[PDB]
Amino acid sequence: DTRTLWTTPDTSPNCTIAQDKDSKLTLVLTKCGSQILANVSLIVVAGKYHIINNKTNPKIKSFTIKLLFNKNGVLLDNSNLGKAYWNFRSGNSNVSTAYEKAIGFMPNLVAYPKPSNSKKYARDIVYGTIYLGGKPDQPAVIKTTFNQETGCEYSITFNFSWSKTYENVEFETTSFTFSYIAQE
Amino acid sequence: TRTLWTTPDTSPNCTIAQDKDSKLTLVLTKCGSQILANVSLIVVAGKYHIINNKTNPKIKSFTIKLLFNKNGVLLDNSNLGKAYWNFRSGNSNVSTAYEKAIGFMPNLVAYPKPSNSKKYARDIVYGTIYLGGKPDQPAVIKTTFNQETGCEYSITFNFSWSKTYENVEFETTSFTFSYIAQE
Amino acid sequence: YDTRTLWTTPDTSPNCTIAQDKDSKLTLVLTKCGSQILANVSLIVVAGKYHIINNKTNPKIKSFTIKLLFNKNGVLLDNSNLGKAYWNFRSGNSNVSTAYEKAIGFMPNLVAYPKPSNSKKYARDIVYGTIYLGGKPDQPAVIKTTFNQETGCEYSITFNFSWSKTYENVEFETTSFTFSYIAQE
Ligand SMILES: CC(=O)N[C@H]1[C@H]([C@H](O)[C@H](O)CO)O[C@@](O)(C(=O)O)C[C@@H]1O
Ligand SMILES: CC(=O)N[C@H]1[C@H]([C@H](O)[C@H](O)CO)O[C@@](O)(C(=O)O)C[C@@H]1O
Ligand SMILES: CC(=O)N[C@H]1[C@H]([C@H](O)[C@H](O)CO)O[C@@](O)(C(=O)O)C[C@@H]1O
Ligand SMILES: [Zn+2]
Ligand SMILES: [Zn+2]
Ligand SMILES: [Zn+2]
């Protein structure tokens, strides 16, 4: 109702992009009535997307992190984010019990409809720019899409892409804030 | 009572050039002293539906105005229609039109009404939305608080672009901003 | 009395020292929404070095920083650029009668944004944004907000204002920027 659904703010890897637990996705979802206030950042610690080099690897330009939810708002097992520490805040960590329901934290289906025969509108997307290493001249685009995945009831997906040729740049980002209309 | 919105549907509610030619999706959530705001626009017909700058070089901007009285009631003078601007009830509105919404109005000390005194830029918020969800099609959304005359409160959205777009449908991604509330 | 809001008040009375005493008004509003702080910021320089920007006359004037430093209790330290006099909890459009003793719930989270130490420094304690001088679209200036990266304090929120363009006689008064950060409690 007014609680926080988050990933914990530690640096302990909780996310799988290319290989297992290669990244820490810090995501904090806070319910303010009909809108959800969201704060996001990413640290890649290992694998394909850890150290970006577009001189040696020119085709590594984008990747996606998917969060898939069922009818009750529980994170599905096939999401990129691990189910382990995706829960309500208890202090600096989480409560002992994994949550039953989080429908109030899901994106609104009327505002952000699933793919169908009807006309797809752009309002289910939010664009933002974060910066690698905190450097102002190293931007990367974060594209957030609501409810556009199949095999779920609700989805939040993060697409990270860049158009610059980076040479040995560690992929860890500044933080970005956005919001979206809630289901309940 | 914590949310003022246009309804999350796609039923056209806004007049830019011709009558009801657009859908302005605006949600205002009260968070104490600040109002969390989320906004997108879909133009369905008329002058600003399919943008062609190579045919029409002058069509580069337009403004949607919301004008309020002392009680925070929307005026029929505004670009957005009064019919579907109300407090949240599920995925729709309350059956009765609201009487007072001063808590949702932009703070007068922070954003003063037009007057002989100095005008500061802090009553403006700048954002970038994208047409058709395409990253290579940016358009500027300029939000201004309490800068219209003939009303007590106002939130205006100015859409502008500097790129030459050919056959591009004006339907936008969402943008989130906030402002200081009157009470 | 509103304990869910820490602000400078939304007036235009100089409260901040960048180059000379009270040369600016920093309007900052911190609204607590559970474990996230919704923040709203703008800057008006009224006098001194950074008031009227002329980069043709003064090529090197391209940046400045406004620092807010806090102790263990979340009280603003006097060596901060922002004056303590009107940094308080909200009462109407003004502040409460007496200065606050605690505001830990408004401080940046320490696990999320750790104090300078021997550990690996992560970029997530930075929020980048762009505001505009005079409200003109062709006059951008980058606002860089960093959490808990100053030494000599327990908490800190710093605002670095910088620009790349050569501005000639431009009054440094900005549009508003909204962001959020994870709260300590
Ligand atoms: C934080 C920020 O806004 N950075 C922007 C920078 C800076 O204006 C300059 O590098 C001066 O620091 O310019 C860019 O064109 C770039 O480098 O790709 C876009 C980027 O978004
Ligand atoms: C979402 C986003 O930030 N898009 C930006 C794009 C993309 O960086 C590139 O098109 C790579 O896809 O580049 C622009 O110069 C453009 O096309 O006008 C600015 C625009 O704001
Ligand atoms: C509000 C906004 O996005 N302004 C942007 C402007 C405008 O697109 C053009 O001036 C057209 O008015 O273009 C810039 O390249 C510039 O002038 O430095 C970046 C700046 O951020
Ligand atoms: Zn690393
Ligand atoms: Zn259309
Ligand atoms: Zn001045």
Author numbering:
A (entry chain A): 182 to 365
B (entry chain C): 183 to 365
C (entry chain B): 181 to 365
List sentences quoted exactly from the publication behind this structure:
Epidemic keratoconjunctivitis (EKC) is a severe ocular infection and is caused by the highly contagious adenoviruses Ad8, Ad19, and Ad37. The initial event leading to EKC is binding of the viruses to glycans that contain sialic acid moieties on epithelial cells in the cornea or conjunctiva through trimeric fiber structures extending from the viral particles. The receptor-binding domain, the fiber knob, is located at the C terminus of each fiber and contains three separate pockets that each can accommodate one sialic acid residue. The crystal structure of the fiber-knob protein shows that the three known sialic acid binding sites are separated by distances of about 10 Å.
Instead we selected the three small and flexible scaffolds tris(2-aminoethyl)amine, 2-(aminomethyl)-2-methyl-1,3-propanediamine, and 2,2-diaminomethyl-1,3-propanediamine for conjugation with the sialic acid derivative 1 through the use of squaric acid chemistry and thus prepared ME0322, ME0323, and ME0324 in modest to good yields. We reasoned that longer flexible spacers would enable all three binding pockets to be occupied simultaneously by one molecule. Only the terminal sialic acid residues of ME0322 are visible in the final electron-density map. We did not observe electron density for the rest of the compound, probably because the flexible linkers do not make defined contacts with the protein. It is, however, likely that all three sialic acids in a fiber knob belong to the same trivalent compound. Analysis of the crystal packing shows that the distances between sialic acid binding sites in different knobs are too large to be bridged by a single ME0322 molecule (data not shown). The binding of all sialic acid residues and their interactions with their respective protein chains are identical to the previously established binding mode between the sialic acid residues of sialyl-α(2,3)-lactose or the GD1a hexasaccharide and the Ad37 fiber knob. The binding was shown to fit to a simple one-to-one binding model, and the calculated Kd value for the interaction of the Ad37 fiber-knob protein with ME0322 was calculated to be 14 μm. Compound ME0322 proved to be very potent and inhibited the infection of HCE cells by Ad37 virions with an IC50 value of 0.38 μm.
